[PDB]
């Protein structure tokens, strides 16, 4: 838990934070206001890929960054 980004709202860090994976499955016109390339907060590389732009990683330099926003 506490990877980097968040599911929909901020502050929290999703319920399942086993592996941090930058999954971007826009599928079709995405859903809500999207996210910062869904940095992660899910399971490990289970197959993913194919269309969905994801970069799975078990932390260790996945989130260590200055900030999310950037005026």
């Amino acid at each position: 838990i506490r990877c980097f980004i968040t599911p929909d709202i901020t502050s929290k860090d999703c319920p399942n934070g086993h592996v941090c994976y930058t999954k971007t499955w826009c599928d079709a016109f995405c859903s809500i206001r999207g996210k910062r390339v869904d940095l992660g907060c899910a399971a490990t590389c289970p197959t993913v890929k194919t269309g969905v732009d994801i970069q799975c990683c078990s932390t260790d330099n996945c989130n260590p960054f200055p900030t999310r926003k950037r005026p």
């Binding site: 968040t6 929909d8 709202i9 901020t10 502050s11 809500i32 206001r33 996210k35 910062r36 900030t67 999310r68 926003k69």
Partner: peptide, 18 residues
């Protein structure tokens, strides 16, 4: 209707909608 509603998301504040 002014500073009542606000869409957070991404990073800044808590719960977005209601």
């Amino acid at each position: 209707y002014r500073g009542w509603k606000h869409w957070v998301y991404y990073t800044c504040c808590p719960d977005t909608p209601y």
